[PDB]
């Protein structure tokens, strides 16, 4: 028993998940005594905490997640998140957090595949079918290359390479190299290592009998 008592109630853990350029935030809380069956989500810009804009559908609802599409257009800022935990007829707790759209951007839902050839890797990341000219996102994609224990990372140009399937070819390897690829991004720093399920593909193992 250390520090202060564990508050297994007022958790107020906020998590944002980007499902194909769609900002989806979820709130995580514990039920020590009172169990809130309805929650209300409100947001605004950090510029001036006054215009508390409520989200449609995500107001006094039974859903623990809120899906946005055109609500969060201030990509050049950090939308403040406030959680109003209503419990029947009275509010239990209210916490506030902030998330920079140019710092986090937890990407993971997009499907990705990696084909192993005789001497090269055929990476194929399936990104949403959207034209870059219709969007305005500033972020770089990094492909992790864990080849037979060798942890490497490849960060190429995403200028017109995110609109569809990201075809990346990794060469300079040897046969029998099981490689694990992770799809994460980078913003201001590499602290946004949103590593996705590292899929491991094994290209033709050249560990056969050694002859003349």
């Amino acid at each position: 028993s250390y520090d202060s008592p564990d508050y297994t109630d007022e958790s107020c853990t906020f998590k944002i998940s980007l499902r194909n350029f769609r900002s989806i935030l979820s709130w995580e809380l514990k039920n020590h005594s009172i169990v809130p069956t309805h929650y209300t989500l409100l947001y605004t810009i950090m510029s001036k905490p006054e215009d508390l804009k409520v989200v449609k559908n995500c107001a006094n609802t039974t859903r623990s997640f809120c899906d946005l599409t055109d609500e969060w257009r201030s990509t050049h800022e950090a939308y403040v998140t406030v959680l109003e935990g209503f419990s029947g007829n009275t509010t239990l707790f209210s916490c506030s957090h902030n998330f920079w759209l140019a710092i986090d951007m937890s990407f993971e839902p997009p499907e990705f595949e990696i084909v192993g050839f005789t001497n090269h890797i055929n990476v194929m990341v399936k990104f949403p079918s959207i034209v870059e000219e219709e969007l305005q996102f500033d972020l770089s994609l990094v492909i992790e290359e864990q080849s037979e224990g060798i942890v490497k990372k490849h960060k190429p140009e995403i200028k017109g390479n995110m609109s569809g399937n990201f075809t990346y070819i990794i060469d300079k390897l040897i046969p029998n190299t099981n490689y694990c690829v992770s799809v994460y991004l980078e913003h201001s720093d590499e602290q946004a290592v949103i590593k996705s399920p590292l899929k491991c593909t094994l290209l033709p193992p050249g560990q056969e009998s050694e002859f003349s």
Partner: protein, 165 residues
């Protein structure tokens, strides 16, 4: 001078620095908060290609001076402020580079000074805000919030190339 739009880590880094120096959430300071009146006119309008560089350069001057004060240095994180001053200086050098070279940066009329003056006036309102709130934590958050929102969309001219209609 940065002529080609290859990549940029300047503003990106500032977004991190000011975020790391943050103390609390803006919602926690729903009381001592108000609009400073950020003039986007002399930023997002008229000036588009390098024309806003002189403004940005002198704008950072105000930011640097404001944060380099004994007040701000004791309010924010001195260790993180060190990086802030470094990055600000870097951005200053990056911006004035186009001013030193024979690039069309200061070819604009008196309107170039108007933006600078507007920035100084806008920042001066912040100085009064700090004095009114007696440099209270909540006031700092609001100040940092505005400086953040203004600086992020300062290079907006070279970032917001979405709509051309």
């Amino acid at each position: 001078c940065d002529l080609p739009q290859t990549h940029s880590l300047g503003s990106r880094r500032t977004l991190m620095l000011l975020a790391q120096m943050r103390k609390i959430s803006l919602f926690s300071c729903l009381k001592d908060r108000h609009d400073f009146g950020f003039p986007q006119e002399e930023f997002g309008n008229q000036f588009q290609k390098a024309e806003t560089i002189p403004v940005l350069h002198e704008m950072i001057q105000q930011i640097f001076n404001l944060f380099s004060t004994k007040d701000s240095s004791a309010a924010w994180d001195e260790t993180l402020l060190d990086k802030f001053y470094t990055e600000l200086y870097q951005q200053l050098n990056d911006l004035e580079a186009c001013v030193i070279q024979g690039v069309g940066v200061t070819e604009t009329p008196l309107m170039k000074e108007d933006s600078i003056l507007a920035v100084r006036k806008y920042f001066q309102r912040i100085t009064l805000y700090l004095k009114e709130k007696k440099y209270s934590p909540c006031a700092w958050e609001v100040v940092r919030a505005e400086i953040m929102r203004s600086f992020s969309l300062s290079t907006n001219l070279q970032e917001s190339l979405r709509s051309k209609e």
